[PDB]
């Protein structure tokens, strides 16, 4: 993510600032930081702001500028061509960008949000069914980091401290059994009810960095205010309310909606079980731990050796230590390349098939096939241009193109209307 922080200025920037002290007449220039600190901690010439803003943010700003192509654009300092094209493909997958590279209506809003386009899309779908105080709480946690301390890091594995650690890891996940972001949401939310006097004890019981939450607590105020500004026309009139930051427990329907907001944000970083996409290709069983169970992203390229595609879930993740068979589609904040034997994955939550298509209907990843002819599978044709029927959707890469490695979603009922000779997805029915 991109964040704005206080940081040491460049040496030359500092020298110019000395100059205007003496521009009027010869000046004493004072620096709170020491000279020896100045040589070490100040860069000679400040880094270009083009290098500082995210490349995907540069693209989205240009798409607000409707620039025909990132490359046709003239600029002083280059990001790489392929990275800029990747950002375009990235934004398209979110639904921010059309197939014709024009900025969508939602694309325009993600441009307006100061936050990163992936996190900006969250600020859009956050305000659904009174789940807004959460998606800020998740988003604040995601950017700040993971407050939890691993048992391996602590050195508790002394044994009794592991039991309390395990009980602490359990009480994280009472909210959501199979999701790792939501157990964290239960925690970042949990301390809020906990009194300030007892926060440090709650911090010690759960091995939580006391400092890293105060920035989360401060950050959620800032993020909620930005969303309240952007959503409401009177964007300056809206003010941050502590009661607004305060949140009530979700319903199971809200959880499923929350799982959808998680999927909109990292729709690219979603992986199916490798065994699910190729049953019996790689030997898997319940005895194999969830470290052993492989996964493969839809967006990932197909590889000559299946194991190269395969990615594996983290041990600290609850889904690993439940001891139950994981769900088919998993979705991860980031892929951790550490571990040659197995590539580590942290998964926010578990996303279902048809709901995954619902982040797919919004985005451009989904590919819909033709209507089928079978028993009870007739297509209603109300007008010459519109129809209702069941269509098999394939998420990301199609069957025809084998360069990537995609998975096919089960067929779902849908309303289709012809535009430009191809029938757009009005809504699943």
């Amino acid at each position: 993510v991109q964040s704005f922080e206080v940081g040491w200025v460049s040496k030359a920037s500092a020298n110019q600032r000395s100059g205007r002290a003496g521009r009027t007449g010869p000046g004493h220039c004072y620096r709170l930081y020491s000279s020896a600190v100045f040589e070490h901690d100040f860069e000679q010439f400040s880094k270009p702001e083009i290098l500082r803003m995210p490349v995907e943010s540069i693209v989205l700003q240009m798409k607000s500028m409707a620039i025909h192509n990132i490359i046709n654009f003239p600029f002083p300092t280059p990001p790489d061509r392929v990275a800029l094209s990747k950002a375009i493909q990235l934004l398209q997958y979110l639904g921010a960008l059309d197939n014709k590279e024009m900025i969508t209506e939602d694309g325009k809003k993600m441009s307006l949000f100061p936050l990163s386009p992936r996190f900006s899309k969250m600020l859009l779908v956050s305000d659904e069914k009174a789940c807004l105080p959460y998606i800020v709480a998740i988003v604040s946690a995601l950017s700040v980091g993971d407050p939890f301390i691993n048992e391996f890091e602590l050195g508790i594995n002394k044994k009794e401290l592991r039991s309390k650690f395990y009980k602490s890891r359990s009480q994280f996940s009472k909210l959501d059994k199979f999701s790792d972001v939501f157990r964290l949401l239960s925690v970042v939310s949990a301390m809020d009810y906990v009194p300030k006097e007892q926060k440090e004890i709650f911090m010690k019981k759960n091995f939580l960095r006391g400092k890293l939450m105060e920035e989360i607590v401060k950050l959620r105020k800032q993020l909620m205010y930005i969303i309240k500004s952007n959503t409401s026309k009177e964007n300056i009139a809206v003010v941050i309310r502590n009661e607004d930051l305060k949140s009530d427990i979700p319903s199971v329907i809200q959880i499923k909606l929350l799982k959808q907001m998680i999927c909109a944000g990292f729709v690219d970083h979603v992986a199916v079980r490798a065994d699910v996409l190729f049953p019996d290709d790689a030997k898997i069983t319940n005895r194999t731990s969830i470290i052993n169970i492989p996964y493969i992203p839809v967006l990932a390229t197909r590889t000559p050796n299946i194991e190269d595609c395969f990615v594996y879930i983290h041990p600290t993740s609850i889904l690993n230590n439940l001891g139950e068979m994981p769900p088919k589609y998993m979705l991860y904040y980031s892929l951790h390349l550490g571990g040659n034997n197995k590539t580590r994955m942290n998964t926010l939550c578990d996303i279902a098939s048809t709901p995954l298509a619902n982040i797919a209907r919004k985005g451009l990843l989904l590919t819909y096939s033709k209507p089928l002819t079978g028993q009870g599978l007739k297509t209603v044709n109300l007008s010459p241009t519109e129809r209702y029927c069941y269509v098999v959707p394939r998420f990301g890469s199609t069957v025809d193109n084998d360069l990537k490695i995609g998975w096919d979603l089960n067929p779902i009922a849908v309303h289709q209307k012809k535009q430009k000779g191809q029938w757009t997805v009005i809504k699943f029915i």
Partner: peptide, 4 residues
């Protein structure tokens, strides 16, 4: 509290 409920989250606990």
């Amino acid at each position: 509290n409920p989250w606990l």
